[PDB]
């Protein structure tokens, strides 16, 4: 069953931006309803935990700029696994998240902190979301080769040979 | 020129007939062979034009299928342009043809761009265009001027790229 | 970065050769056939080298992660960013291999091994045929 | 520009067409 690749997949939510608008405060809230947000990530678990509790270079800059991002670490350091964190922000139109997974290897002999490993690239441009360059290059080259093949077969069709002259047109 | 001792006669700054300082020009086997071939064919064309004044085929000479056909065209060019009185020119042209690293003008331009993008000395650039070295240290030892002036990683990258650029015969 | 640098220089020379063949085809008068063959063969073998070198360094290209510059402004150059970002094939090639697969259309595996044995048999047969007659 | 005001655009709104009854009419084209 034909599936559109998620790298080119682009979601638009006019109702959400009309109701709430685009801001770093609710950029994760905007991302929550997208298909790219896995329901198995620990961010959703933290979200239900918060809901139950209520019912009952630029990395350091964005680190020190917002306190909710702080709360994100102090709620995310306890849970290791696939997590969604912000990468960088330039207002009022550009935001990009950092898709990384954490394995807090607390074993004896490792003086390093929890291991952070990239998984995917996500770019929020306007109200749209974008998600390999190797594929782009090979696709461009293969389409170029197809066009070249068509041109060369047409040119060879145009070619006419005679023994007494050689090849002419 | 281990210590870049080029003397007064071959200074880096040259005074031309116009009186303006120019960078000293150094050509490897490929560049010199292409330049001399172009000059010879231009002189032959001028001679033919003059003969027509007193009283098509030239496209096949520059484009050679093989080394032997190129040598035959070279012999014909020397017969029709030099007169056969200059054996040293024939020996130099044969040495250029047999050990020309690069036959196509575009590839020679690529080699020139790769070698002189770093801004090295023209002597070193011409030597690198003449010599094919497997390892950076081999070139550095065989070219004492390149020592202490180019990083080993850059030299290795340049040498590997040049080896890849060599057109298969 | 070294692998992508080599890819850059080789693709740049390939694009230069493409520009060449372009501005010698754009002339109102067609040059001699032989010059066209030489240009075709040189550019096409250069494309082969491009493919081979891109094959060699897949790991370095894959390991790299794309990210826009902090200094690069997206508000004014979003069109330029989207131009390079998009990667979907041209449609005509798409329905081209769709019709190709339509025409082509444990069983598949044993046909695959039957193709293996036909290939090996044909190779051996032509080796024998070449050995039969002295070609030197 | 940043405030999306309803029912006043130069060009027809995509959200207007989404909220328009033509969407469900196409969805309920079988019922037609």
């Amino acid at each position: 069953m034909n599936v559109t690749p998620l790298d080119e997949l682009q979601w638009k939510s006019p109702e959400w931006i009309q109701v709430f608008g685009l801001r770093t405060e609710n950029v994760l809230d905007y991302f929550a309803e997208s298909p790219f947000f896995d329901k198995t990530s620990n961010n959703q678990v933290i979200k239900m935990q918060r809901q139950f509790s209520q019912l009952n270079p630029a990395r350091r800059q964005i680190l020190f700029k917002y306190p909710m991002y702080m709360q994100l670490e102090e709620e995310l350091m306890k849970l290791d696994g696939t997590e969604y964190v912000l990468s960088s922000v330039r207002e009022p139109d550009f935001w990009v998240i950092r898709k990384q997974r954490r394995t807090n290897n607390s074993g004896v002999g490792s003086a390093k902190g929890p291991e952070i490993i990239p998984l995917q690239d996500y770019y929020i441009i306007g109200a749209n979301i974008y998600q390999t360059i190797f594929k782009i290059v090979q696709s461009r080259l293969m389409s170029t080769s197809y066009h070249l093949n068509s041109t060369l077969e047409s040119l060879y069709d145009l070619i006419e040979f005679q023994p007494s002259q050689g090849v002419h047109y | 020129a281990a210590t870049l001792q080029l003397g007064q006669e071959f200074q880096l700054k040259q005074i031309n007939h116009q009186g303006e300082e120019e960078e000293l020009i150094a050509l490897n086997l490929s560049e010199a062979r292409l330049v001399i071939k172009e000059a010879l064919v231009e002189r032959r064309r001028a001679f033919k034009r003059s003969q027509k004044k007193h009283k098509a085929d030239d496209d096949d000479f520059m484009h050679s299928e093989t080394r032997e056909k190129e040598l035959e065209s070279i012999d014909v060019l020397l017969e029709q342009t030099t007169g056969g009185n200059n054996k040293d020119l024939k020996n130099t042209m044969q040495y250029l043809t047999n050990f020309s690293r690069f036959r196509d003008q575009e590839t020679v331009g690529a080699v020139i761009q790769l070698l002189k993008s770093t801004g090295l000395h023209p002597f070193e650039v011409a030597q690198l265009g003449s010599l094919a070295c497997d390892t950076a240290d081999e070139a550095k030892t065989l070219i004492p001027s390149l020592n202490n002036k180019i990083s080993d990683d850059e030299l290795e990258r340049i040498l590997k790229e040049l080896s890849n650029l060599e057109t298969l015969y | 970065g070294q692998a992508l640098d080599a890819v850059r220089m080789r693709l740049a020379q390939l694009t230069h050769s493409l520009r060449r063949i372009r501005d010698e085809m754009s002339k109102a008068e067609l040059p001699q056939w032989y010059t066209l063959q030489s240009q075709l063969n040189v550019t096409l073998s250069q494309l082969v080298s491009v493919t081979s070198t891109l094959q060699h360094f897949q790991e370095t290209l894959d390991s790299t992660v794309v990210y826009p510059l902090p200094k690069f402004p997206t508000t004014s150059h979003e069109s330029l960013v989207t131009t390079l970002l998009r990667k979907k094939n041209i449609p005509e090639v798409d329905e081209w291999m769709k019709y190709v697969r339509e025409t082509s259309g444990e069983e598949i595996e044993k046909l695959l091994q039957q193709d293996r044995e036909i290939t090996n048999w044909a190779r051996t047969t032509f080796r024998n045929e070449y050995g039969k007659h002295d070609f030197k | 520009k940043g405030a999306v005001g309803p029912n006043n655009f130069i060009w027809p709104a995509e959200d207007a067409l989404r909220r328009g009854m033509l969407a469900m009419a196409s969805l309920h084209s079988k019922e037609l």
């Binding site: 559109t4 080119e8 997949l9 109702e15 | 020139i112 | 131009t83 | -």
Partner: peptide
């Protein structure tokens, strides 16, 4: 040096083929 730089071969007129489909909520 560099014999000649490459001519700008930008094609902004290219319409692109981005698939758009997950717009409905």
């Amino acid at each position: 040096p560099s014999y000649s730089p490459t001519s700008p071969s930008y094609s902004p007129t290219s319409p692109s083929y981005s698939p758009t489909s997950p717009s409905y909520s």
